[PDB]
Structures are given as C-alpha cells and as structure tokens.
XYZ file of C-alpha atoms in Angstrom:
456
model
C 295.542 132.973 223.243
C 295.138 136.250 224.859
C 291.674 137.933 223.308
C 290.518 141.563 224.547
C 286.951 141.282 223.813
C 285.749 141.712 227.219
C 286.286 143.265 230.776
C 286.910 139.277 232.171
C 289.868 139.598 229.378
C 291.430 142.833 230.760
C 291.112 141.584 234.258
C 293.184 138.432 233.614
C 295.663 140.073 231.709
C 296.059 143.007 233.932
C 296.385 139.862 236.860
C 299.081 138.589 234.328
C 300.985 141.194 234.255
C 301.085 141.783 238.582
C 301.981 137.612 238.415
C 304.524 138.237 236.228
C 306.165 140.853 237.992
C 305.866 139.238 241.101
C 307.731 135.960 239.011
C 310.417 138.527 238.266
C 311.572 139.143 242.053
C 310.191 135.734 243.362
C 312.374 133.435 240.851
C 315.605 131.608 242.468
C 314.375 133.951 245.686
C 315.840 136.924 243.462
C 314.991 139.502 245.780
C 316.592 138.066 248.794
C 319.273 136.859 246.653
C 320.228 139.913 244.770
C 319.234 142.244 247.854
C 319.810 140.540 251.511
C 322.583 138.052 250.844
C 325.330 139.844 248.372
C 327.579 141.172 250.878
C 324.560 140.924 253.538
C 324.725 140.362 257.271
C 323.919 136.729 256.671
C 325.668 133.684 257.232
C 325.620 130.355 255.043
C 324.727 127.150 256.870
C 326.504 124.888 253.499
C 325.521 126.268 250.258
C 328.897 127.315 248.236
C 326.096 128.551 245.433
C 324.309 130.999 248.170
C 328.319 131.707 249.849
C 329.332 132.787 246.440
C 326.150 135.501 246.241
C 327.446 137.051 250.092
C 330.987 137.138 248.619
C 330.078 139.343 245.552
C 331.801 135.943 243.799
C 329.151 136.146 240.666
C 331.661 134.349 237.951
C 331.745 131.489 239.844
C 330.629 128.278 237.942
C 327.109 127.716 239.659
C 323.987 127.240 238.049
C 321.921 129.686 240.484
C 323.886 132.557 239.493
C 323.456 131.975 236.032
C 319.470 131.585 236.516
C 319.576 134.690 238.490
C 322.215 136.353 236.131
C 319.619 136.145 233.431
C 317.094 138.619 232.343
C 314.287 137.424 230.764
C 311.900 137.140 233.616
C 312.040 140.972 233.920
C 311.388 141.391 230.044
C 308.538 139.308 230.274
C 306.823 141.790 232.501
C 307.475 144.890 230.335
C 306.655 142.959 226.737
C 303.062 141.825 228.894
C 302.807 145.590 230.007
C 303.465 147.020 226.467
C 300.513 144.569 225.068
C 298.103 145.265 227.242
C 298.701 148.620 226.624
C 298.603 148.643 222.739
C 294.990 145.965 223.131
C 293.318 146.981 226.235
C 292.192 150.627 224.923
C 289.894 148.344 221.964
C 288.023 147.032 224.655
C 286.344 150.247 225.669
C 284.935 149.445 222.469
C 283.955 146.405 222.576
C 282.107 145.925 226.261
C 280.153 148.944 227.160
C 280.670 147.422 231.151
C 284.421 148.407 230.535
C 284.759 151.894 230.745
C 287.324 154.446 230.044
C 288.004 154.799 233.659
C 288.995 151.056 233.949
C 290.914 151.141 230.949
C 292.931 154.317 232.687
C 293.008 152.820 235.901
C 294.946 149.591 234.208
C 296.861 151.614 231.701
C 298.364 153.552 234.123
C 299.042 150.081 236.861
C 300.969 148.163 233.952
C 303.145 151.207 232.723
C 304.045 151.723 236.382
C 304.385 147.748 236.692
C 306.657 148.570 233.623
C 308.565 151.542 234.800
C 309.311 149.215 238.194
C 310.649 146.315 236.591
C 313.172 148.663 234.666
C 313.796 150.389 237.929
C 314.285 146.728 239.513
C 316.425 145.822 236.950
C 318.275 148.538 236.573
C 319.606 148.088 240.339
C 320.577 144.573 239.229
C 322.528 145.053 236.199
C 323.316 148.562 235.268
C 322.587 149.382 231.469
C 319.660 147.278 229.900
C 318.143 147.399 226.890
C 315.177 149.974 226.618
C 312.601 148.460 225.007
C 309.301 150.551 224.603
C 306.924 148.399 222.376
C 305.571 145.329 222.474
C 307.420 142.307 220.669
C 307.027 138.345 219.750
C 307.931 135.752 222.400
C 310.988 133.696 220.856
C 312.474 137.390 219.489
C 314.195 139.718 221.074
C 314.936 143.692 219.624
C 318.188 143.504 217.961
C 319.591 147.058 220.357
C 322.816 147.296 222.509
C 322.258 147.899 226.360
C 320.859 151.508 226.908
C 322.642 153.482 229.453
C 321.460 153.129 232.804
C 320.626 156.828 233.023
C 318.242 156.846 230.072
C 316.591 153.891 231.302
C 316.019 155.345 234.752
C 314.573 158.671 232.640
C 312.364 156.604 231.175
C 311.324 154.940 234.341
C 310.578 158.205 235.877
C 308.738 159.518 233.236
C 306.763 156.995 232.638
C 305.742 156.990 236.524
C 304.761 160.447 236.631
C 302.556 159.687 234.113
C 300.889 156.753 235.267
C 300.279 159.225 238.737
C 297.704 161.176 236.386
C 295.694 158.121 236.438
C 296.474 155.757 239.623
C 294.480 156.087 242.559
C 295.258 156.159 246.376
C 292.344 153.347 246.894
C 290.224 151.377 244.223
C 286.347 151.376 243.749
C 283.315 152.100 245.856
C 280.826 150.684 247.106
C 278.731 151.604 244.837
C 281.226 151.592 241.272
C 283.153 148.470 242.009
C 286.580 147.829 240.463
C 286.794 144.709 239.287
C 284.429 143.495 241.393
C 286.070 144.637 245.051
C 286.320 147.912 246.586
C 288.374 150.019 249.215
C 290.310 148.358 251.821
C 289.814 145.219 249.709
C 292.146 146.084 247.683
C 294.746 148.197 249.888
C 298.168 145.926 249.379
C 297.405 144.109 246.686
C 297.125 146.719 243.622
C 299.798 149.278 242.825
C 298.078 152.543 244.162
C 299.397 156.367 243.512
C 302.085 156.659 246.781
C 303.116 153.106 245.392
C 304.354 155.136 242.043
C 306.040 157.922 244.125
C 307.358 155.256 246.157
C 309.598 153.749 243.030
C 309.894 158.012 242.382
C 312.017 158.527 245.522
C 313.944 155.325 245.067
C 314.908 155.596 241.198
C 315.909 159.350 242.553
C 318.082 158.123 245.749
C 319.541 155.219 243.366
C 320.835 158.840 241.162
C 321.996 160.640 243.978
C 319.592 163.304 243.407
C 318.127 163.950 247.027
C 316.392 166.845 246.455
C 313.907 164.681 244.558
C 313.891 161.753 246.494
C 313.358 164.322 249.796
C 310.029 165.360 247.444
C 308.786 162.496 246.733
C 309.486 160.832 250.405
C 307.927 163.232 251.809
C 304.845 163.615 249.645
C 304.346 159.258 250.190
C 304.137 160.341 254.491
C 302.208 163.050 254.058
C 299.608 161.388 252.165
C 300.042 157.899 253.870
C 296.356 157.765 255.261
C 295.031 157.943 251.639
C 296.106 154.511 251.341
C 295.576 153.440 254.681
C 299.772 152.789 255.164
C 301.169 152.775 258.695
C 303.862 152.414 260.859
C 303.979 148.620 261.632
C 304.178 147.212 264.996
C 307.205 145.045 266.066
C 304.527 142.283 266.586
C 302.536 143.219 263.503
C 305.718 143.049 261.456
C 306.395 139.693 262.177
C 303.672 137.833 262.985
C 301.674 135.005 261.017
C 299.014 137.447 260.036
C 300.851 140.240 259.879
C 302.375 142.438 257.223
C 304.100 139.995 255.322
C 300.429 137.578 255.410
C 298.518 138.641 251.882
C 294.971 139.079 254.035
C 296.938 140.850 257.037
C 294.321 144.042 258.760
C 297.625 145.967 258.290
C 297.661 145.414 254.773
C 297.723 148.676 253.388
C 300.927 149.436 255.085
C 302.084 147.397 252.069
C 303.250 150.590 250.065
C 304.248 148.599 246.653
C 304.839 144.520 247.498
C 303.612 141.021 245.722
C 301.218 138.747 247.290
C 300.882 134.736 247.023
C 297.838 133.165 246.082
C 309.987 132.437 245.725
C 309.542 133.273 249.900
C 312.704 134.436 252.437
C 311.509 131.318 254.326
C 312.712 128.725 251.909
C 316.752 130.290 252.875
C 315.931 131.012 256.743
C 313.189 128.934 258.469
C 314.384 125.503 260.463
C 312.924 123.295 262.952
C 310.858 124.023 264.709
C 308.957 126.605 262.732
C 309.107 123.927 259.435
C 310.650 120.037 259.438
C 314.178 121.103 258.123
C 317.093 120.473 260.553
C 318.945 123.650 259.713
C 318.475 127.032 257.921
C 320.723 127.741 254.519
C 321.457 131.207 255.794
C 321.166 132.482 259.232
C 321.924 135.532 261.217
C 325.150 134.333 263.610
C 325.109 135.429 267.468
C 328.384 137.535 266.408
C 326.069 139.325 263.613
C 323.384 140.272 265.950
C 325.385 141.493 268.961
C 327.300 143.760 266.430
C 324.251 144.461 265.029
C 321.899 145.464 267.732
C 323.318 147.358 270.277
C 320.573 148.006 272.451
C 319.123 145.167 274.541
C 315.695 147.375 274.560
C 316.126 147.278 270.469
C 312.315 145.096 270.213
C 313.639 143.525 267.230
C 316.327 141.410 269.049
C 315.683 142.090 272.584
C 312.525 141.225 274.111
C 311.089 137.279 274.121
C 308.259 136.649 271.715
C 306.065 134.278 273.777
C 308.695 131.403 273.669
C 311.713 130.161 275.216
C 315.384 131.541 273.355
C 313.054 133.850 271.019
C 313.094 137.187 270.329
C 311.291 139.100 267.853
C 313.619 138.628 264.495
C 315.745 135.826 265.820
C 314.350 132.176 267.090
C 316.625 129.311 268.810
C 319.022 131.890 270.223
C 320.082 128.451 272.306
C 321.593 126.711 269.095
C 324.705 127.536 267.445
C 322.590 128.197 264.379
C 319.673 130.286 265.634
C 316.931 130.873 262.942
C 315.947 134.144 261.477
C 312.256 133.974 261.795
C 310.896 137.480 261.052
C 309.647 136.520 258.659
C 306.882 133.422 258.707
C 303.861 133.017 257.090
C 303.699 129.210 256.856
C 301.046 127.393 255.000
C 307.072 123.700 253.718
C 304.763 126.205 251.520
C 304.991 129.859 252.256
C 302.739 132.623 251.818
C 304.976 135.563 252.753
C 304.285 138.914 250.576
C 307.341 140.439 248.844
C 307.370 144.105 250.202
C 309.381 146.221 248.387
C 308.486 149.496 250.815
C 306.578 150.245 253.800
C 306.799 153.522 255.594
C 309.471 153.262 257.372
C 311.259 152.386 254.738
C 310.158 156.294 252.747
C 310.976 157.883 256.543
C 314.265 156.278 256.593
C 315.243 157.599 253.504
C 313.996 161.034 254.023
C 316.520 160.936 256.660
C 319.167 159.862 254.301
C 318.043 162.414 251.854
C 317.770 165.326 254.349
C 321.182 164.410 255.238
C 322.635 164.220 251.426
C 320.921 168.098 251.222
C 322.984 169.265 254.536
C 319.917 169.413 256.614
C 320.546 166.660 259.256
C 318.884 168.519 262.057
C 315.550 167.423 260.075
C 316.938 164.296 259.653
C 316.781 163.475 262.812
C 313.153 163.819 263.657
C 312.464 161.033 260.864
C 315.196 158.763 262.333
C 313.707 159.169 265.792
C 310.225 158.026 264.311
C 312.028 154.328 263.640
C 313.932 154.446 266.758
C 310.961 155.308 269.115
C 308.591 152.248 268.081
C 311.485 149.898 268.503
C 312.158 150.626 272.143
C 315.352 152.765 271.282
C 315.534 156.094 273.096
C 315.387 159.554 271.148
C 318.602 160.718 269.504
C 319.799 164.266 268.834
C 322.002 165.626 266.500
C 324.687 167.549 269.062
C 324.664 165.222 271.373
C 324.760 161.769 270.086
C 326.669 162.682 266.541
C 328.293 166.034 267.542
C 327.038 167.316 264.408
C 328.802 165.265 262.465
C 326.769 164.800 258.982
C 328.326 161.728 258.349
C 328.155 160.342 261.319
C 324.208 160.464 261.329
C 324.447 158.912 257.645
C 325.782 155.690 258.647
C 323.240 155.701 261.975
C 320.607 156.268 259.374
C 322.040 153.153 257.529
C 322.379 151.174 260.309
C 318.607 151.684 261.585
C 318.101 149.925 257.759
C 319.795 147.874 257.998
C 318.059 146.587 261.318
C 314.991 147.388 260.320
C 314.512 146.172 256.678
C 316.486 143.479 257.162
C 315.411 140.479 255.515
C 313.399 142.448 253.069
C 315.809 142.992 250.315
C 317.453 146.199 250.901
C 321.020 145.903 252.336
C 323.007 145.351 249.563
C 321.059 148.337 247.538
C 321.768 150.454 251.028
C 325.363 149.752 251.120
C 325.747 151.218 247.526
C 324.113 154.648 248.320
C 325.920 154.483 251.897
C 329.143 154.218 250.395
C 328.255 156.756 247.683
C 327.606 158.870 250.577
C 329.862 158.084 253.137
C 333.389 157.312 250.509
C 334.670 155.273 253.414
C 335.664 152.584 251.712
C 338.456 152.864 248.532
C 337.888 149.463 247.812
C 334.153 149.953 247.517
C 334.004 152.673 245.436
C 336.353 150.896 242.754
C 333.883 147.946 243.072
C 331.006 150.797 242.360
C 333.461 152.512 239.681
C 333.941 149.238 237.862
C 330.789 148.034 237.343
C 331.680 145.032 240.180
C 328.439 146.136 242.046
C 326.054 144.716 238.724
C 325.083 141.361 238.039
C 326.811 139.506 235.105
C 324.399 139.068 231.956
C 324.010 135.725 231.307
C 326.071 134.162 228.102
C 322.744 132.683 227.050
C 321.767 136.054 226.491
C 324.720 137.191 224.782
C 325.220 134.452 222.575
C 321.323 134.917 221.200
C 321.803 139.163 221.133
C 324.979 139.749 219.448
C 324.979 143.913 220.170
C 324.846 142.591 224.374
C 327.979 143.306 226.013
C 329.283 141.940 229.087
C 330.034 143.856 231.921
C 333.377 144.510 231.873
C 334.023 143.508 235.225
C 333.304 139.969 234.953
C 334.572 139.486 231.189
C-alpha cells in the first residue's frame, strides 16, 4: 500500500502518476489510434479493427474500439494525481530531507499531469465527468458527464496554477531534485513551457486564438529555458534521436512520455523488425499528394540506403514502410511526444491567421518550411492574400510534419472549424460524430452516463 512517510515515497508515487499517464495514451496505441489513424493519411495493410478507426466507423462490433472507447485509464491518472495531492503535503512533516519546495515542485507536476489528462480526454470524448477529489478504486462518483467547456475551465485553471510552481529545468548541482539535476532531466519531467504548452492547445481546441497566440508565443520565446529546439530532419528520425528517451536533443521534448504502446508496433516491417508487412502504411498515392516538393527532406532526399527517404523506407515495394519513427530495442522504445516546437510555431501560424493577421503568420510558417528544404513563402505571392488559403497551407505543413505523432485527426477538427469547407464535416463536428463512443461497460456501472447521441 501506498505510505507517505518519506521522500523515497513521494518519488515513487509522483513516478506513478507520470507511468500512469503515459499508460493512458500508450494503451491499445491510443494516441496513434485516436490521433493519426481516424480519418488519417494512413492506409491499412488487413486489419478491419484498425480500417474501422480511419473510417470514423466507431460502432462497429470490435473489441479494440471498445478497449479504446473506454475511460478508465485516463481516470486512473487524475484519482493518482488527486491522492498525492491530498498525502504528499504530510510528508513535509514527516522527513525533514523533503522540503516544501519538493512538495511544490510535485504538487504542481501532478495537477498539471491532471489538468492534461482532462485536456486529453476531453479531445477524445467531449463531456466527461469532472471529478476533483480523490476516490476508492472499485467506485466511481455517482455525477452525469460535465460539459466539455467546464472541464476545459477547469483544465486551464488548474494549469495556470501549477505555472506558479513548475520550473523551466529541475535541480542544481548543488540542491539536487530527486537525486538528478539540469539537462538530466530536460524531456522527461513536465517543466513550466510544458504547462503553457497544454495552455495554447486547450485554447486552439476552443477557438479562442487570441489565447492560444499568447501562450504560443510565450513557449518560443522562452524555448532556451528548457533547452527545446527546432529538430533536425535527421535528428527527428533517427535511432537516438528525439523520439529515443536518452536522445542529446531531448529537451526539444516540450511535454512527451518516455519508456523505461509505440507507433512502431502499426508501421515498422522487414527489414527494420522480422514482420513481413506493416498494419498501416503511408501508400505511394498518399505521399505524392502529400509532398509536393521533391526538395521536401521528409520524403525527398535518401537516408543512407537504397529506396529510403527520410519518413518513408522500401519506396520499391507496393507497401513501403513508414519508418520515421524507430527506436528499436520487436520491443520499442519510442517517446510519446505530444509537442515540440514546431508544433507551438505551427500553431501560432494558425492562430495569427484565426486573429486576421496572416502576414505574421507567415514568418512562423516559413520557420517549418526553411529546415525542410522548402523555399520561403509569402503571403501576396504564393496565397494572393487569401486568409484561407494560408490556413489550409498551415495545415498541410502539419500535417507533413507531425505526422505520425498523433495530431491529424485533432488538426482536421480545428481546420474545418476554420476553413467550413466541408458541410458534411461540420455536421459530423455538430453532432457529436467527431467523439469517441463511451463504452457500455461504463454506462451500465454509472447509471447518470449518457451516450453520445451520435452513436446511440
């Protein structure tokens, strides 16, 4: 049983709670699941489970959506954050080598831990229930699902708050935290652009762009606090690069998970591992729509071997392998990451645009386009000043350049929130057809949960 005597208790259950949340997007590949392949730019090899994810077909009678479809693994991160943070403050107390410093450098991790897996899960199914205070495992609060809104209030709140306390780095040399310091822990903890980063996103997710521009621009601005970069084609993707937990480019890890649930087990194939083909792949049709630039360094250039390139491996095959992403041990040790700087400069773009300032936007575009080999863009002459024409070039340089890291479905939502090109879509949006179901097992244990009315 959990104690809170001493600082060797805080530690582990301040590790438990970053496990847990990691469990939360890891599970059934969740994040690539819920944010890559629904409606994504990636083909299924054989998988009618995995086809019925990319065709938005989430009633359909297969046991991974009803795994994914249920949301306990996201409670169990905010019940873990809400103990620690009724127990931890006792230990103060207790062990004179914990000290109220630690305790509100942990506090303030697992309430924004807490405040992300609402965010997270807010994304996923639309109204939740807001729980606030810790409860028994086997129970559940007897409460409807909260509006969305008032959960995402909540959420931001909550990470404001935890900003007071969170730091850009962790320890010194000489007043270790936890027994590391510094760059040792750059990527691994949640740090105070980390917070802002979930700020801008919760506040994009809302439409509300003037926020989100804020916040973007405060993460950029104070980028080398944290030691958080713009990534390297080569860096992105290698072995021991970003996605490798120990990678020198680490800190450019804004808020992710590390290993000690990986986009491999869905895309890698012989020969990077000894399975004969990949469950999901992106088709030769996909990537020349795609990329339309042969100088584009994702898909363009050879990386070392024959038929590679820097996303895309086997381009000989009928099934070439999306290989990105690789950090092999098969067993993988790929880090979730949830944002990364070009992910906050992208969005400034997006939220620049949203405000009617698109001349700005462009600057922050051109940051992406000019370390990918892709020549400078300007407003008059490439988009004729069209506002939405630079939105969807904004979502298209996404979609490129997070692919595979669980944004595209999330990005087509605010696209077509943006753009309104798409009737269809914004019924799907309207409906409630963009959510997740909630899982009968749920239901049937929590009479006030209701279904969402689209898939009733």
């Amino acid at each position: 049983t959990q104690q809170w005597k001493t600082l060797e208790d805080t530690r582990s259950a301040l590790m438990g709670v970053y496990g847990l949340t990691r469990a939360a997007l890891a599970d059934n590949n969740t994040h690539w699941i819920c944010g890559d392949l629904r409606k994504g730019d990636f083909t299924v090899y054989k998988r009618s489970d995995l086809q019925a994810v990319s065709d938005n077909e989430l009633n359909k009678p297969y046991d991974l959506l009803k795994k994914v479809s249920n949301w306990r693994r996201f409670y169990a991160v905010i019940n873990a954050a809400s103990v620690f943070m009724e127990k931890a403050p006792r230990t103060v107390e207790l062990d004179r080598s914990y000290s109220e410093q630690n305790l509100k450098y942990d506090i303030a991790q697992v309430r924004a831990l807490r405040a992300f897996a609402y965010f997270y899960m807010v994304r996923i199914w639309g109204d939740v229930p807001l729980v606030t205070y810790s409860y028994d495992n086997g129970t559940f609060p007897s409460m409807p699902r909260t509006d969305a809104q008032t959960v995402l209030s909540y959420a931001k709140a909550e990470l404001l708050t935890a900003i007071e306390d969170l730091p850009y780095q962790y320890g010194t040399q000489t007043n270790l935290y936890y027994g590391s310091y510094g760059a040792q822990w750059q990527g691994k903890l949640f740090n105070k652009l980390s917070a802002y980063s979930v700020l801008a996103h919760i506040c994009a997710w809302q439409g509300n762009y003037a926020e989100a521009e804020t916040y973007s621009a405060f993460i950029i601005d104070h980028a080398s606090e944290i030691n958080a970069k713009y990534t390297s084609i080569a860096d992105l993707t290698s072995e021991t690069g970003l996605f490798y937990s120990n990678a020198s480019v680490k800190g450019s890890r804004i808020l992710g998970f590390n290993f000690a649930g990986h986009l491999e087990q869905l895309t890698l194939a012989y020969p990077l591992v000894q399975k004969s083909y990949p469950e999901i792949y992106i088709s030769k049709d996909s990537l020349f729509s795609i990329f339309t630039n042969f100088d584009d360094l994702r898909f363009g250039i050879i990386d070392t071997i024959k038929y590679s390139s820097y996303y895309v491996q086997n381009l000989n095959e009928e099934t070439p392998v999306f290989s990105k992403i690789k950090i092999i041990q098969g067993v993988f040790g790929s880090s979730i990451v949830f944002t990364r700087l070009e992910d906050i400069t992208l969005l400034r773009a997006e939220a620049l645009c949203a405000l009617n300032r698109s001349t700005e936007a462009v600057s922050y575009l051109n940051m992406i386009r000019t370390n990918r080999g892709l020549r400078e863009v300007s407003f008059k002459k490439d988009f004729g000043n069209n506002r939405e024409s630079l939105i969807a070039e904004i979502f298209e340089e996404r979609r490129r350049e997070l692919m595979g890291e669980g944004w595209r479905w999330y990005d087509l939502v605010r696209r077509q929130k943006l753009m309104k090109d798409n009737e269809a879509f914004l019924r799907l949006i309207s409906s409630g057809g963009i959510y997740w179901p909630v899982s009968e097992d749920i239901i049937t244990a929590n009479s006030q949960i209701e279904q969402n009315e689209f898939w009733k």
